[PDB]
C-alpha cells in the first residue's frame, strides 16, 4: 500500500527529524564515526538554526536514551522556575495567568546543559566537531521554510515598536525571512564560536564540555541572559514586566538523569519522561484500554481512544506537575483503570472527569472550567522540534527540544536568541501539583518515547504539537503495533501517513489556557463515515485539512536481524528521515 | 500544495537516486570531502548491490557531467556489439529477433570503464574509498525491496534447471531473497576486494584506477566474462546459444567522451546523449511544440504531447542508431518541425509516421508494423536505475546505469554478476541505422538529462523505464518549467508527484518488440474527465494504478543564490533524495 516515503531500511544508521537539514547533519556525524548521541547533539543545534520559530538554545528538552547494552534512561533538560518566581509575586503584578510571552514566562534554560551532559557522558566527539554544522548554517545561511517568515510577520509590530533586539536579527532593514533566500543569524554563530574559543584550552574532550557548561551557567552567556531578563519587556498582559531570574538561578541548575515512567502493554513496554512532563498520559491511555480492542481504524476504535484520552488528560490536569508527589503507580494500576474504563460510554463526554487514585480527592485549578472560544491563535507548526537516532551499535535516542522560539521573547542582543516561555504552563494558584513553584519544573508538554518489545529497545519516536504530542504518539504507536509489517519490518511510515486526530476537551497548556468541550479534530482523509459516526455519538467534530495532524518521527531496530529502519512525517514538507 | 516529500533545499550537497541506500552512500562521499563525481561512482556501485534486478557491473551507463566552470559533456559507457556479432551470424542460428536473454544479447560491458574514467578525470578519491560502500552491502548485506525476490521467483525454473550459477547466488538452499532479511553476495564482494588488492600497489591515485580498467579489460574479470559468454546457455529462443564476445573485444573497448545533443527552448537548453541513445527524442518533442502551449495539465496539453511524442518516436525508430549517420540538425530544425506539427490532428493517431529529414525517405525494420498483444511480461520496475548529484562547488552529474540484471543472464560464477542484454534492441536486418553491427552500440534506452537556463547548468535529472524514459522526462521537465515556484525554488517534487503518463504506439526496444497502436497509459489520479476526453479523441486509454508512472530523480542549483535542491519519486517506496 502506497506511502509518501519508504520506511527506510539499513545497517549503518538512521535519523528522523522535523527538518531535513537537521536529519542529514546528524547523519553526517554517524558517517564521520560518531554515535547516536554525538549525532543528536549536532542535529539539535542545527534545529535551533533551522526551526527558530519552534525552538532555540535557551529552551528545553527531555531526552530518552537507550544505550545498546544497558537501561533506558531519561536526561532531564527541562529547567525550573526561578527562586523569586512565586504565585504571590506574579499575583502582585495583577496577573491571573502566567503570560504567554516575556521574561516572566522564562524557566531556567535547560536544553544546553542537557545536550552537554549527553555529549560528555554518552558521546565520543568534541563540542567543536558536533556543533560546526549549526555554526555553518548560522553564519553562511539556509533556505528557510515559509513558516519562519510567516511567524516573524505575525509579531512584526511587536518587534519594531517594542522588541527591537528581535527586529535587529529577524527584520534587518525591515526585511522578514523569505524562502529561497539564505537566512542568517551571524550573532548566534559568533556566540558558539566564542564559546568554543574559550573552552578549547580547557583540556581533554570531557573537560571542554564541562567548561562549556560553566560558560553557559556563569560566563558571558549567563550574564547576558540575566541582563535581558531584568530589562522591562512588553508581554501578553499589555505591560512591560521584568523577570525574577538571577545569576544564582543559572549558576545552581544542572540537567539531571532519571528512570523513565514505563508501562507494559501487549508484549511492549513504552518508556516516557516522568509526570513533571505530560509523558505518563500516553501510558495512562494504554492502561485504560481493554484487552480486546475494536477493529483498527474503525469508528469504535477512534471513539474508544478519544474518550480514553479525555479521561487520561483529566488525570494529567488534576495530578501532574512538579510541586507535589504524583500517584503514578496508582494511576497505572489495574484496579484504578478497571474502574476508569467503565466511564467510557456510548456517547461523547463534554466533561473533564479526573479520577481518585488511592481515594485522593482531585483538586483542580480555578481556571480548569474555562472555555476557549474563537479561532486558535497563529500556529507556527501549521500545515517544538523532534529528532530520533539509532546507530550501527544499536544505541537509540529520542529528544523533543523546544522553547526559546523567536515570537515570544526579545532576542538577547549579545547572544542572538531569546529566553523561553515554559512557566506559562504552571498555575498562579497555591496548593496544586502544577502550582508555579521556585526550584520546580513546570508541567511540560515535551514528551519523547522509546518502545521496548519483550524488554528490548526497538523503536524511538516522538513529535511536536503541544497538547497533541501524546495523542498523536498514542495513535501512532498503536498503529505500529496493530498494522501489518511492510518489507518484513514495522510499518513505521504507513503508521505516520495514517489519518491522525486529536481532541481539545481539557484545559490547554498554553496561555490563555482555554478548553473546548467535546471538541475533536480529524484529518479530511479519514473516512467521512467515521466523522459521521462520531457526530452521531455527540462529538463536536472539526474536519481539518487532509495533511495536518502529527509531525511524527521514528527510528527502529529489529533485534532478531539487527536491521535499522526510519520513517518521517510528510505534512508541511519538512520532516524527513535519512539513513542506510 | 501537498507533496510526498519536500523539495530539499541546502548549501552543501544534494543526491537523488532510485534507491535510498545509494543516495545516502553517495552523500557520505560528499560529507567526507568528495565531489559530485566521487559520489556518483560510489552510489553507482551500491546500485549494483541494491538493484541487481535492474542493473549490474557488466551493464552500461550514459553519464552527463556539468563541471562548475566548463562545458556540459557526455561520457559514453554504452558498449558495442562484438566483432563477430553480425546479422548474418545471428540469422544463421535461425533467429528473427535478437533474444531478450543469454550471451548473444550481451554488448561489451561498458559501465565499469565509464565509472573508472569519471573517477580518474573528474574525481578526487581513490577507488578503495569510493566503493567500500558497495563492498559492505555486498558482504554484510542489506534489506532488499520485495521486487528483488519477486524477480528471482519469476525466473526460478530457469535458474534451478538451466542457469545454476545464478541459483547458487540468488537461491542458496532454494531460498529466494526476502525483504526484512539481509541479502548478500559474497562473491561480488570478493571480486571488488581482489580488484582493489591487485591495483593497490599500482602507484598514484589515477594509476590505480587505470590499472583497474585493465583488470576489467584483460585481467581475471575479462577472462571470466569471455569464459561465461562461450558456454552454451539457454535463452528466450528455447535453444542453448553461445556468445561471439571474445577476449579481444574487451581488450579494445573504452568509454569515450562526446558533446551532448542539445536544443534551446523557451530560455532553457536540454542536454542529452547523442542519437546512439534515444536521448534526442526528448529534444525532438520540444522542437515539435508550438510557441503557444495549452493550459498546463489540461486535456489539450496531454493530447498535444501524446501525438507529438508518437511523431518523435517514429523518427527514432526510423533514424536513430549507431550503424549510420543520423540527420539530427534537420530533425531539430524549425523548417522540418514546422511541417511535422501540422500532423498533430484533433483525433489520435494509431499509425507510425516517420518524417523525411533532408528529403531522405524513411527505411523501417520489417518488424516495425508487428503488434504486441495481450498483457505484458513481468515489469521489475513495477510498483534500469538513475542517480543525480550536485555538490558544494556546483558540479553536477546525471547517470542512468542499467543492464547486467539478474533475470536475463546466468551469473558469471567467479564474479557474482551476469552479462548484459542490450543487443536485444538492434535489428537482425541490414542497411538500417540500428542494424546489429560489430563495433557499434545498439540504440539504447538509457537517457539522462541536464537542463540549462540562460546557458548555465541548473538541473540534473533522469528516470528509468525503457521506452517511457524520455516520455516521463519530457512531462517532468515541462512541468518544472511551467509550474509555479515553491519556496522560491523550482517545483521539483510537485513536478515528480504530478500525474504522469506514456504511450506505447511505436515498436518497443525490448524483445519481443511489439507495438500497441493508439495505446496510452495514465495514472488513476489524473482527472477522470481528461481520460474521458482522450477516449473521445480516439485514444486506447489504459487507466494504470495511482502511483505507477515515472521513477524520476532530480537535483538542481539556483545560479543567482547558490542554493542546491533535490526531489525524488515516491512510487514504489524506493526512490529518495538526500542533502543539506
Tab-separated table of C-alpha atoms in Angstrom, chain B residues 350-497:
chain	number	residue	atom	x	y	z
B	350	UNK	CA	-2.843	4.827	-34.462
B	351	UNK	CA	-0.081	4.872	-37.120
B	352	UNK	CA	3.711	5.129	-37.065
B	353	UNK	CA	4.575	8.182	-39.201
B	354	UNK	CA	8.322	8.848	-39.525
B	355	UNK	CA	9.287	12.027	-41.344
B	356	UNK	CA	11.692	12.881	-44.166
B	357	UNK	CA	14.667	14.905	-42.785
B	358	UNK	CA	16.509	16.489	-45.744
B	359	UNK	CA	14.229	14.756	-48.240
B	360	UNK	CA	15.565	11.307	-47.235
B	361	UNK	CA	12.979	8.518	-47.436
B	362	UNK	CA	12.434	6.568	-44.186
B	363	UNK	CA	13.636	2.957	-44.039
B	364	UNK	CA	11.915	0.857	-41.359
B	365	UNK	CA	12.631	-2.617	-39.942
B	366	UNK	CA	10.447	-5.399	-41.345
B	367	UNK	CA	9.256	-5.858	-37.691
B	368	UNK	CA	8.189	-2.211	-37.285
B	369	UNK	CA	4.497	-2.994	-38.083
B	370	UNK	CA	4.217	-6.003	-35.757
B	371	UNK	CA	1.707	-5.709	-32.920
B	372	UNK	CA	2.193	-6.502	-29.220
B	373	UNK	CA	-0.901	-8.339	-27.974
B	374	UNK	CA	-2.165	-9.406	-24.611
B	375	UNK	CA	-0.727	-8.361	-21.272
B	376	UNK	CA	2.997	-7.542	-20.658
B	377	UNK	CA	5.953	-9.506	-19.364
B	378	UNK	CA	6.885	-9.125	-15.716
B	379	UNK	CA	7.940	-5.495	-15.098
B	380	UNK	CA	10.816	-5.434	-12.473
B	381	UNK	CA	10.337	-1.618	-12.307
B	382	UNK	CA	6.694	-2.219	-11.256
B	383	UNK	CA	5.164	-0.667	-8.138
B	384	UNK	CA	17.434	0.444	-15.188
B	385	UNK	CA	18.485	2.831	-12.363
B	386	UNK	CA	19.315	6.524	-12.003
B	387	UNK	CA	21.309	8.907	-9.815
B	388	UNK	CA	21.927	12.713	-9.834
B	389	UNK	CA	24.415	14.680	-7.756
B	390	UNK	CA	25.207	18.331	-7.225
B	391	UNK	CA	27.998	19.371	-4.830
B	392	UNK	CA	29.116	22.452	-2.878
B	393	UNK	CA	31.230	23.642	-5.846
B	394	UNK	CA	28.200	23.401	-8.153
B	395	UNK	CA	29.435	20.379	-10.159
B	396	UNK	CA	26.636	18.166	-11.489
B	397	UNK	CA	26.142	14.594	-12.784
B	398	UNK	CA	23.167	12.695	-14.156
B	399	UNK	CA	23.608	8.990	-14.977
B	400	UNK	CA	21.171	6.222	-15.897
B	401	UNK	CA	23.107	2.950	-15.386
B	402	UNK	CA	21.468	-0.299	-16.414
B	403	UNK	CA	21.954	-3.811	-17.696
B	404	UNK	CA	23.590	-6.851	-16.197
B	405	UNK	CA	20.439	-7.595	-14.233
B	406	UNK	CA	19.927	-10.980	-12.657
B	407	UNK	CA	16.848	-12.124	-14.691
B	408	UNK	CA	18.445	-12.260	-18.116
B	409	UNK	CA	21.842	-13.955	-17.994
B	410	UNK	CA	23.471	-16.601	-15.808
B	411	UNK	CA	25.844	-15.332	-13.135
B	412	UNK	CA	29.479	-15.396	-14.145
B	413	UNK	CA	30.312	-17.797	-11.281
B	414	UNK	CA	33.759	-16.444	-10.334
B	415	UNK	CA	32.457	-12.815	-10.357
B	416	UNK	CA	28.958	-12.843	-8.852
B	417	UNK	CA	27.093	-10.991	-11.636
B	418	UNK	CA	25.855	-11.713	-15.179
B	419	UNK	CA	26.454	-10.143	-18.589
B	420	UNK	CA	24.026	-7.673	-20.143
B	421	UNK	CA	21.374	-7.863	-22.857
B	422	UNK	CA	21.475	-4.516	-24.698
B	423	UNK	CA	21.944	-6.022	-28.179
B	424	UNK	CA	18.269	-7.031	-27.965
B	425	UNK	CA	17.418	-3.507	-29.126
B	426	UNK	CA	19.121	-3.874	-32.542
B	427	UNK	CA	17.550	-5.341	-35.647
B	428	UNK	CA	18.582	-8.557	-37.451
B	429	UNK	CA	18.211	-6.830	-40.807
B	430	UNK	CA	20.944	-4.927	-42.643
B	431	UNK	CA	21.018	-1.468	-44.121
B	432	UNK	CA	19.373	0.248	-41.106
B	433	UNK	CA	20.622	2.930	-38.618
B	434	UNK	CA	20.078	0.384	-35.816
B	435	UNK	CA	21.164	-2.751	-37.723
B	436	UNK	CA	23.078	-5.126	-35.484
B	437	UNK	CA	26.627	-4.125	-36.311
B	438	UNK	CA	30.060	-5.190	-34.938
B	439	UNK	CA	31.815	-2.396	-33.034
B	440	UNK	CA	28.640	-0.262	-32.889
B	441	UNK	CA	26.426	0.459	-29.926
B	442	UNK	CA	22.854	-0.770	-30.043
B	443	UNK	CA	20.410	2.114	-29.914
B	444	UNK	CA	19.931	2.301	-26.183
B	445	UNK	CA	17.062	3.435	-23.981
B	446	UNK	CA	19.390	4.941	-21.357
B	447	UNK	CA	18.959	8.678	-21.429
B	448	UNK	CA	19.958	11.030	-18.604
B	449	UNK	CA	19.320	14.788	-18.813
B	450	UNK	CA	20.967	18.052	-17.829
B	451	UNK	CA	18.995	21.294	-18.214
B	452	UNK	CA	20.440	24.785	-18.697
B	453	UNK	CA	18.761	28.151	-18.071
B	454	UNK	CA	20.420	31.083	-19.944
B	455	UNK	CA	23.233	28.643	-20.832
B	456	UNK	CA	24.000	27.899	-17.151
B	457	UNK	CA	23.695	24.382	-15.642
B	458	UNK	CA	20.581	24.363	-13.463
B	459	UNK	CA	19.039	20.848	-13.193
B	460	UNK	CA	20.302	17.297	-13.466
B	461	UNK	CA	17.678	14.596	-13.685
B	462	UNK	CA	16.568	11.252	-15.031
B	463	UNK	CA	14.426	8.165	-14.651
B	464	UNK	CA	14.464	4.505	-15.521
B	465	UNK	CA	11.693	2.926	-17.596
B	466	UNK	CA	12.914	1.876	-21.048
B	467	UNK	CA	10.693	3.356	-23.759
B	468	UNK	CA	8.968	5.576	-21.181
B	469	UNK	CA	12.204	7.281	-20.031
B	470	UNK	CA	12.108	10.315	-22.340
B	471	UNK	CA	8.313	10.494	-22.239
B	472	UNK	CA	8.155	10.810	-18.453
B	473	UNK	CA	11.201	13.086	-18.503
B	474	UNK	CA	9.570	15.330	-21.082
B	475	UNK	CA	6.378	15.643	-18.950
B	476	UNK	CA	8.578	16.327	-15.885
B	477	UNK	CA	10.844	18.927	-17.454
B	478	UNK	CA	7.849	20.799	-18.913
B	479	UNK	CA	6.142	20.730	-15.532
B	480	UNK	CA	9.347	22.082	-13.900
B	481	UNK	CA	9.357	24.939	-16.426
B	482	UNK	CA	5.567	25.622	-16.254
B	483	UNK	CA	4.655	25.073	-12.583
B	484	UNK	CA	4.804	27.962	-10.128
B	485	UNK	CA	7.867	28.031	-7.864
B	486	UNK	CA	7.611	26.629	-4.355
B	487	UNK	CA	9.684	28.187	-1.567
B	488	UNK	CA	11.266	30.496	-4.157
B	489	UNK	CA	12.665	27.444	-5.965
B	490	UNK	CA	11.853	25.089	-8.819
B	491	UNK	CA	8.880	22.823	-8.017
B	492	UNK	CA	10.903	19.633	-8.496
B	493	UNK	CA	8.837	17.382	-6.196
B	494	UNK	CA	5.441	18.792	-7.283
B	495	UNK	CA	6.553	18.011	-10.820
B	496	UNK	CA	7.584	14.476	-9.821
B	497	UNK	CA	4.401	13.934	-7.773
